Design a protein around this ligand. Structure first.
Ligand SMILES: *[C@@H](C)[C@H]1/C(=C/c2[nH]c(/C=C3N=C(/C=C4\NC(=O)C(CC)=C4C)C(C)=C\3CCC(=O)O)c(CCC(=O)O)c2C)NC(=O)[C@@H]1C
Lengths: 172, 162, 162, 172, 162, 172, 172, 162, 162, 172, 162, 172
């Protein structure tokens, strides 16, 4: 896997080049914005259980067919595995936030996932919905002005939202 | 690629765990250290040409047989001298990658894996590269923690060649 | 026991490697973070009794059936109330260990492993402990990064109970 | 394994106690002395190859019987394994320096080691000698006044020396 | 799915063996026991509604906070009461499946796998379901071996929740 | 795998339903007809070696090309593996008879089997023939009036024949 | 492992003998007493969770040092493992009851157990106490006159008690 | 040793499970079947001598070369005839063990494991033992379910020799 | 297929190694031995018919019950006699393959794998084939090292049938 | 795998035939030409390192894009793996020379190889070039008149060249 | 230790097999080759001193910096020259062992395992030993198959250093 | 493992010495006596089944207690394992004959063997007897004057006898 720094190094090596002054500057900004990234990760992670449980409850409320008998999330085994998948996705999304790059999310979570759901009979569109719910909740928690040094994290929330959208696209 | 950030994730993922404070702290140390690392990477990049040129001659000086013995492995021909400088450039460039990435990953991946094989197959003496690296260490003009950073990755390469 | 320091070593040892700058940086982040962690651990220790006492009542308040239903699992007897306060003390003490150690190790080892089993066997509701933990979070009187530290391990426990 | 901080927590938990004001203070000193510890680790690690090779050369010079035919370090396989062991010991000693505790050294390096050498025919007394040589070299490199902010690291060198002595005792 | 019949086959197939008398006897015991199991399954099915209704109230009676505390996990709203009755129906229906199948398979598969996770995630107390199950056991009106059959699977569920 | 009882439970759970009075009755008939099922299984199993050996001999007599050099059942290894496959099929067919359901036969024997023979060069049509021979023999042995309490097992023989036909279809 | 029937066969084979008329008679009694054995197993098994939890609670009440900090059953991991061991023992004791022979208990539970506790620091005397508590509870539940066809199960309770005593001896 | 009872336990223990009704039913089938098995074992034991004697001659009859060809593997000497009768006794005795134990375990353990090796090493024809076993099957004088029991283990041996 | 040549390669390839003198020597021994092996293979091929015919009768002679007992496994019918001669031909032909290939590979592959199974399933006595093989050994008319070669593979077959 | 002798036996068995007089003669020629085969194998093997290193150097000289940054043989890992593949191919080609048959080369080296390079982005055409260079060098070394009993090995060199061409075709 | 004989056994033992003709042939090739191998081993032993002495100088000639550069790895001191000659002696002695043993085993075991490590750790150039080995090859004065034998193990060493 | 040649090399390397003229001569004798060694190995191996079966029969005839019920070689499993062990020993003895050294026999067969029999209840004295019977038979077959070029193999038979005696000592 790559983080944002290794990502740049990997691009530069493919060219056989030293970093340009513009790339140093970029990467120095990343470092300067580091605290905010750590807050986002902390906040989302510290609230992982409620993000998932609240998003599950919302999903099943909007799509009760998933938990009707015969439904894909009916029985505790299928419920447990569904909740699990929501946990897994949120986990890799937070890794991605830490790294500032999606390679861990793409490589270790998102690849083969659509095909996997297609084989099981799990409706990917429903998964996408659950991811979006977690997204909205993750971002409200991460971007909460209370109890934190005031500043703008908008760029970061955009990036974060991007990992969630990416994940939702991968399954939908 | 091995960086403080990817190590932190790898540790969490290995256990099926969300990131904990345990790991965020590691990444914070990386972010704080980056100021010194980035200084070093910039200075080494800015001065790369003279460092490479000086390093090449330091090798030829210590091992003058490399400039006179016949053989594609030696720098006794223009093409051999060009390959030698290229290689030294490689090492220096990898140091700068390690500094930017905050870890050994780039050098591990791009340079150290396969190194002994390539050196033994093409009859290149590790001692040559070590001299080049010792020169760079001696003459990079860094002080304080920027020098500690540059030297840690230079000595890492030296260790890998020993 | 999982700490930033033991994680750093574990990562190196897993690969048969000497420590690299990659890991020293992680440990440095730990050392720098320790100032905030230690503040938090001290304040929570100094104020432990009132936190525990307040936390117990916050539970009884939210779940008053715990003070009236008959049963060894409830706090409807003096002995039950004493076990409840002891447990809350345990949680708080583990938070402080996590802060001192710079990681989740103590709580993982001493408290979380086996937790679901013990809760299910002795008919203890996780929701009880979560309320206790929410109280402690609300009332520990820390601000700034000392509070961020305390809260990260408190929320970790909350997550483990959810 | 334990580091110095977990070591204290483990002792405290065995008693069921919160940390005392004296223990916080101690552990805060450890933190305050952290940079020096990182320098020692860096320095010893950065010079690992020469510490080992110079110590090997010194050993075989003083005990040529080890590399005479029949000798325990004769043949390249036995030489390689000897050098390796010196590498391994130095490695775990540096882990121990980082952790401020020997549990990693004891648990993962030193236990079973005497018995292992006794079974192979490897003279432990010779190993001890090699460890002591590495010790002297490690400490001269770690405690070199040149190129570092001046201060006293004597306590640390004592601790470091202690891990090396420990290792040498374990095999001798 | 685990039944005396599938266990018998699994044992033979695990060893690459044809069925032996060893296994046919097991299946015969199943066939003979089926008379008692089927009686029980029929009576519990016929009386399911009153059992479920009675069981729900037995829970609300023992744990009246479940009908008053605010929260989606409680039966303090019409929707919560409906989910509670549904769940109890689930348990009862699984008992009847176990009886028809002659084994724990259906309950294992459809209900017990994932049970602790779901209970902990949605903040459902195992003790609630146990009370429901104790009611059903007390009031199913079976005697003789039909009751022994029903009770074995009811107590199995109780054990799984303990 | 499923037996006939679990099969019904699985269908009912997919609907979220309790069993109907008609389904109890059906399943009670199955139980009432249990002894006959045990006899069939016993009888076929007790004669497994001759069913297979007699069916092999008949096959090779009718298709001598299989045991001519070059033939798919030529050499003892290929012969042994052929006999083996006949053993395997008969085994899973008897499991299926015991269970009153083919899921074990389908899942653990019949799936991938055609593709497997196609890859090896084994003529599936020949396998089908061997299965049919075993079928005729299995049923004559199972439905032998001698030495057993008189009654009608015709339904059962139909079912049994069905598993064999199924198997033969799967490879042909 | 052996059951009571295989136990007799194994003794007879060692002598090269057919069963005597006395041994058939014995074994026929075992069969005749089978229902009672099935009731005991059912009853103890059906109440496994309360037998264990009630016995644990009683143990810790009588030996609070086990759950004081430092204590062998202090921390949830050590508690969980203790409860587990009580579960394991009860499980193998019930296997033994079913088999009418202790070989499964001896072979798969009891052997190496003392040495195991001795190595961990787990006080075997305490384990023995927990086993005895489970014994008293298991037998009261198994031998409860209510809700069962009246008869004498005294011999059986003696046998059952014997497996529990055996287990307690093995660790004490 | 494989019996319905040890299979039942093995199935539970393999999964770390307490016994369930699933298994108790198997054991009950064993207990009920034991009446037929025990009848059979008794009759075969009581009549063992004449069965063995008759079985030996049935072999010699079908394969008279076994009584005339020179060779330690044949029954052409008194000692060979004695070994043959002993072996037949063995088979019969194993049948009776299988009946008492309610399963194939004794025969599997004491007789079938190693059987092909011993037969091939000592040049003993399986067809000889099969004839002996066919005789015993034909002439054991059992009817009803006692005969079904005896025959299932006799045919099991026949299968093992084929 | 197992030959001195494929063994030599297998040994090298197993270790990721180029062939060494260690292996070339083995192959040279094979090449030198081939003169004796090829003599033997030629003589056995040239004389195959009379060897097979003589071998068949040697069997019928030693085991005359094989020509008279009713049964598809016996040579009591024209078709049975034809299968017997075919089989003997098979054995002889395999011997010649072993000689040409310089090793047991062909016999291992084409004949020995599955042999016990086929013999036991079709009720064929190994002792029959051994007699055939003993005849061939006695009467192949080879001397010197050509006979040592033929006999080594014939005795190999005999061993495989024992 | 097969050698030239087993190859003939395998063809003969498929026909159920004894070897003809023509086949014995052929195979006797093979034996008679054995020494030359052993020389070729010895010579190529004894010079394996220079054949590979000289062929690598020639390749990169003619296709410098392979070792430009971004190039498929750029970085030491990719270089090492390339050299390795050249080693592997030469190794299996020499096995093939020893065996007088390509089955080892085809089975264990050449199958899946094109697909493997296609998946990695390794240009097969370049591999083919390296194989051809090794071929020319292998044959000059094998067919060197100096230091060996004079005779004609032309047939053998043709065969050898055939294995190399085969290998180059398999990847190109 | 790897010899044609131990390879032959290893191949048989790996498969639980008795030795077959397949292996005896390999060993015979070894026995026949031994005449050439033993000639070579004797001549190299008899002439070892002059070969070693000549080989050392051939190195110093090709790499004269080895006699002048300061460093324990060089032959610029009496002690360094003595270590160099010792090492060359080692190589030559290993060649002779390989010849006596009929395979690479001794050199593999005593010299090649660990070789790259030792060379890299002590800063010894493989190219030095190769020159020594090339000298020995050029000047051992063997012809015919004795030279083919010596050269196969010398080139094996050269390959191991490349 | 070692053969006689490697054995000498190993002794010489331990001394750091070249082979002496006496050692070359010795080893040349070994080579000169090679054919006889190959005959012995061939002969014993070619008769492996009868050596074992005849030795088993002789053993059980002299010690009928081994095959009485209860006996260590009673039941086919125990018989099969006994015969097996006789096969195994003979196998390793023949390896030893080929190698001209017992290291393969000692290392891979004989070590741990006494302890193994002691743990099982297998009487080692009986094993020794079976080994001696095989010895007498192996040597009569190996040293049979018929059908072989006349010469003296007495030294070899002594050596062979030595491996068998060694084996018998190891278990007795
Ligand atoms: C069609 C298969 C033929 C047939 C079957 C048949 N059997 C019965 C009766 C019984 N069969 C058994 C067999 C078993 N019970 C077991 O537990 C086991 C395994 C341990 C076996 C093999 C038994 C016990 C009976 C009852 C007593 C008896 O001997 O009859 C019937 C009568 C109806 C019934 O189901 O009981 C029938 C029809 N009979 C035929 O004529 C078919 C050729």
């Amino acid at each position: 896997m790559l983080d944002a720094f290794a990502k740049v190094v990997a691009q530069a090596d493919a060219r056989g080049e030293f970093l340009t002054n513009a790339q140093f500057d970029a990467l120095s900004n990343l470092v300067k914005e580091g605290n905010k990234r750590l807050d986002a990760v902390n906040r989302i992670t510290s609230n992982a259980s409620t993000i998932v449980a609240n998003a599950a409850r919302a999903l099943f409320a909007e799509q009760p067919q998933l938990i009707q008998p015969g439904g894909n999330a009916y029985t505790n085994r299928r419920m447990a595995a569904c909740l699990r998948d929501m946990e897994i996705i949120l986990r890799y999304v937070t890794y991605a936030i830490l790294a500032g790059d999606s390679s861990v999310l793409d490589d270790r979570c998102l690849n083969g996932l659509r095909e996997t759901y297609q084989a099981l009979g799990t409706p990917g569109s429903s998964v996408a919905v659950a991811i979006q719910k977690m997204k909205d909740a993750a971002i409200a928690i991460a971007n909460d002005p209370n109890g934190i040094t005031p500043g703008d994290c908008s760029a970061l929330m955009s990036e974060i939202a991007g990992y969630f959208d990416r994940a939702a696209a991968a399954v939908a | 690629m091995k960086t403080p950030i990817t190590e932190a994730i790898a540790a969490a993922d290995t256990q099926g765990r969300f990131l904990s404070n345990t790991e965020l702290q590691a990444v914070d140390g990386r972010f704080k250290r980056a100021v010194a690392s980035m200084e070093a990477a910039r200075a080494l990049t800015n001065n790369a040409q003279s460092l490479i040129d000086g390093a090449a001659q330091a090798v030829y000086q210590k091992f003058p047989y490399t400039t006179t013995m016949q053989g594609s492995q030696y720098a006794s021909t223009p093409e051999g001298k060009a390959k030698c400088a290229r290689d030294i450039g490689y090492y220096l460039r990898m140091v700068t990658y390690c500094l930017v990435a905050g870890g050994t990953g780039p050098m591990d991946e791009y340079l150290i894996a396969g190194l002994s094989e390539i050196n033994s197959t093409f009859d290149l003496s590790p001692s040559w590269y070590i001299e080049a690296l010792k020169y760079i260490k001696a003459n990079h003009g860094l002080t304080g923690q920027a020098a500690v950073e540059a030297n840690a990755y230079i000595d890492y390469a030296i260790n890998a060649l020993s």
